[PDB]
Design a protein around this ligand. Structure first.
Ligand SMILES: Nc1ncc(C(=O)NC2CN(C(=O)C3CC3)C2)c2ccc(-c3cccc(F)c3)nc12
Ligand SMILES: [Mg+2]
Lengths: 286, 294
């Protein structure tokens, strides 16, 4: 029981060409300031799958590494169709880190850039985990950048609806099997996803990308922990990947333990990397 | 009109209004209504389409298939993702999901289920004899026309262009209509796609027409995907249904695809073959379309 978005917000275009679904690049009518709008048709069979998606965005978006919730609206539809719920949040102008690697020579980021982004993801995850919230969808597409290289987490669509989605970033425990019938979920599942995102930043695609999603979903709980293809990477980076990709979630380190990892903790070029990333955004824009 | 080419849609087809989204189109020359699926494809994805166009199997028009007219690409500037247009026949009454939802108790009459299922099977029979698996049989992909004609969705099902390219290609979609064999397990490491997979999907669509939703709807898609290859064949909740209907469901939902009947064998099933109210049901469905429209 909110208000109509008319004169307050307006849709411009669909952002991720399908990746995020019905997510638009919106505009605050009065100021002209950009915002991202998630549009979801409120049906009788989706009444509480939308109500608590608003409650999660408002409460947990108050953190520098999470895209801030602005407000929720309802655009009333004529008698013969369902109403549209508009979920407004801060817009991230630089795009996703999947798009960043895709628009880089050799489809690979500098090891210190991976260290900066991964730390910011972990910092965002730490805020959610302390608040008893699992993201459940950490992937390069759900990790966004702003015009001044700020890293922000997005999508609470599956956080703790009938489609399974991309499997490549899923942790083994997330995928139900014979010895894991109920797929015992944990906050540490996001850390496996964070490690796959680091391989994604280092190679331009997640492990098993060249496979059918159904075969990848079958192999993730059977295959040994994924490794980086190239030997060029530092011993600190291999240790971080190893740390994130522990097959059994029961002996996988916590977000706090991973924040203390030398690859995340020891960042001497922090300022220089932030400028290097800011330069890369401008160069791609023009 | 060509299916083996990748022409610009200019002068051939034009978009009219909103209905990978499907938009109401038109044939520039005749004015004939069309359903156009518009997808933003990268330069590399355009080459995948050129390959898959060669993978297309040729087959005639059919009374129970919304005719696929071809694929086109509307060129965007060098750097921007071009638009892939997949043109198909227009069905004014909408999907079966829309029909069962806009019906009291979210259930169709057993004879209506018998008529629709037979028309799905007839459409599937034409594709199967032409070595083509539909791969996405469900209520939402089974359409009705103003004249209460049942037609299957076809945006090049032979090459699966509407599912190979785009952002949602790497996504595992809705699992509820999937046959056990299309889901990978320990003694099925590689998902085997047989023509009979559509028949399991057809049987799940019959449960969808009878109950409003497919079996295991009340579950997380990941748990449903896990249970489909383990759970015994799904059954109808209500005992009200005829012995012919239970037998048809049983016939469609044979766990092992190797032991599942063919489309021809299922067309000879008493629930499909014996239809005395065929004309009356056709009128009943035509009446239902008109009263929903007003
Ligand atoms: N908050 C967001 N800001 C920017 C973009 C995005 O895609 N931005 C790129 C497209 N870009 C532009 O249009 C440039 C010109 C400014 C950058 C963006 C994309 C997806 C989502 C998202 C997904 C699922 C759920 C959800 F609640 C939010 N949220 C956002
Ligand atoms: Mg914030």
């Amino acid at each position: 029981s909110l208000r109509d978005p008319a004169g307050i917000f307006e849709l411009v275009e669909v952002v991720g060409n399908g990746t995020y679904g019905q997510v638009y690049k919106g505009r605050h009518v009065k100021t002209g300031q950009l915002a991202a709008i998630k549009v979801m048709d409120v049906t009788e069979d989706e009444e509480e799958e939308i109500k608590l998606e608003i409650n999660m965005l408002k409460k947990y978006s108050h953190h520098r590494n999470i895209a801030t919730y602005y407000g929720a609206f309802i655009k009333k539809s004529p008698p013969g169709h369902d109403d549209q719920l508009w979920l407004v949040m801060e817009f991230c102008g630089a795009g996703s880190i999947t798009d960043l690697v895709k628009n880089t020579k050799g489809n690979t980021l500098k090891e210190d850039w991976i260290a900066y982004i991964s730390r910011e993801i972990l910092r965002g995850l730490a805020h959610l985990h302390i608040h008893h919230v699992i993201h459940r969808d950490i992937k390069g597409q759900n990790v966004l950048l702003t015009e001044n290289a700020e890293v922000k987490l997005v999508d609470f669509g599956v956080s703790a609806n009938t489609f399974i989605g991309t499997p490549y970033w899923m942790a083994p425990e997330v995928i139900a099997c014979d010895e894991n019938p109920d797929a015992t979920y944990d906050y540490r599942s996001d850390l496996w996803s964070c490690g796959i995102t680091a391989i994604e930043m280092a190679e331009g695609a997640p492990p098993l990308c060249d496979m059918h999603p159904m075969r990848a979903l079958f192999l993730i709980p059977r295959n040994p922990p994924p490794r980086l293809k190239s030997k060029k990477w530092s011993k600190k980076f291999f240790s971080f990947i190893e740390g994130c990709l522990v097959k059994n979630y029961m002996q996988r380190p916590s977000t706090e333990q991973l924040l203390k990892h030398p690859f995340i903790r020891d960042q001497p070029n922090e300022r220089q990397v932030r400028i290097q990333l800011k330069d890369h955004i401008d160069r791609t824009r023009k």
